[PDB]
Amino acid sequence: VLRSVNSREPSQVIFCNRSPRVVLPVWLNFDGEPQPYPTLPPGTGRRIHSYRGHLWLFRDAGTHDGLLVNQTELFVPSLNDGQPIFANITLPVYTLKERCLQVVRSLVKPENYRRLDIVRSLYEDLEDHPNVQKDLERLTQ
Amino acid sequence: MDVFLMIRRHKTTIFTDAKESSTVFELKRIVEGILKRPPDEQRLYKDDQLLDDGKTLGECGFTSQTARPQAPATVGLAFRADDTFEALCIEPFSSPPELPDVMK
Amino acid sequence: MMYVKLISSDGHEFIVKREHALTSGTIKAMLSNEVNFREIPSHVLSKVCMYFTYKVRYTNSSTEIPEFPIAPEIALELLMAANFLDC
Ligand SMILES: Cc1ncsc1-c1ccc(CNC(=O)[C@@H]2C[C@@H](O)CN2C(=O)CC(C)(C)C)cc1
Question: Membrane spanning segments where (chain B)?
């Protein structure tokens, strides 16, 4: 259901990483499978060739934390007067809990989430780390 | 430009914002509305340094670089008992526990 | 009522704008002008208050959003507080 359209109509895009994360661009292919693309370091940009109706999303390359592109989750290249479409990649305002979960995951190996002195539901929250699949099985819902 | 502050006295901390162009006296008015002590019974400080009423917050060192929402600048606050001002005095926040082994 | 008082487990009194506090469903419920938190120490509650400020400032904003910083040493307790306060 969530898939790029095979328009074959070129569209030039600037992926602009205005976040402090290393960014993984993900293209949703014609069958809806996520295809990872080369990463963008913090504060960097890349001019890239995409197509009208193609679907992109953007992740933290290391953690798969969700990022925003032009204030929303999905980016679709559109018709270019000669000039490229700007894709502004930014941090969302994470909830405090999600942000805490991010920090705890970065300090604790997954084997040891269970050794933390916290309620079971918080172990489950740690273990249920960000994942493009769940987000696709949600955006497509 | 908005600057984001913690006004702190003893065990009280007020989170508030103000304009960089606003004055120290204007900040005392903010404090008066909250804590019901007039400006003439207040001293405001940056670190150990007493601030002058007429100075802008920017001139006292509170800027967008130093007084951010997620990391606000601290303004010290002392009250006058009756005749004399109390010594500036901010109770520190509690100490975090040692990092669990699994985080270390 | 522009401000509310949030009191930590160690007696620190945090005075924040009522609308900033009301962003916590839990706090809204505890108000519905002071709330005591027997389990939340001041080194955690101060950060919670900073988060309010950060959220209100950067929500629905075209500007570049900075990372909300959390020191490793408070991350666990802050997580428990965030779970409790629902945010
Ligand atoms: C250099 C770079 N850095 C981050 S992403 C990136 C990049 C971006 C685009 C490309 C070449 N373009 C493509 O692969 C486009 C993007 C997407 O629309 C799909 N695609 C295709 O050419 C269709 C395809 C993969 C031949 C079926 C190569 C590298």
Answer: none
Residue B1 and residue B20 in contact, taking contact as beta carbons nearer than 8 Å: yes
Tell me if B103 and A108 make a contact (CB, 8 A cut-off). yes
Q: What single letter denotes the amino acid at residue B41?
A: E
The CATH class, in words, for A91-141 is mainly alpha
- A96 touches A57 (CB < 8 A): no
Domain ranges of chain C: 1-86
Declared resolution, Å: 2.1
Determine the residue type at B43.
R
- Experimental method reported for this structure: X-ray
C65 touches B: beta carbon within 8 Å? no
Fold that domain C1-86 belongs to in CATH: Potassium Channel Kv1.1; Chain A (3.30.710)
Is residue C37 a contact partner of residue C7, using CB atoms and an 8 Å limit? Answer: yes
Is the CB of A59 inside a 6 Å radius of any atom of ligand 1?
A: no
CATH superfamily entry for domain A2-90: von Hippel-Lindau disease tumour suppressor,  beta domain (2.60.40.780)
Phi-psi region of A103 (alpha: psi -120 to 50; beta: other; left: phi over 0): alpha
Protein residue with least CA distance to atom 21, ligand 1? A50
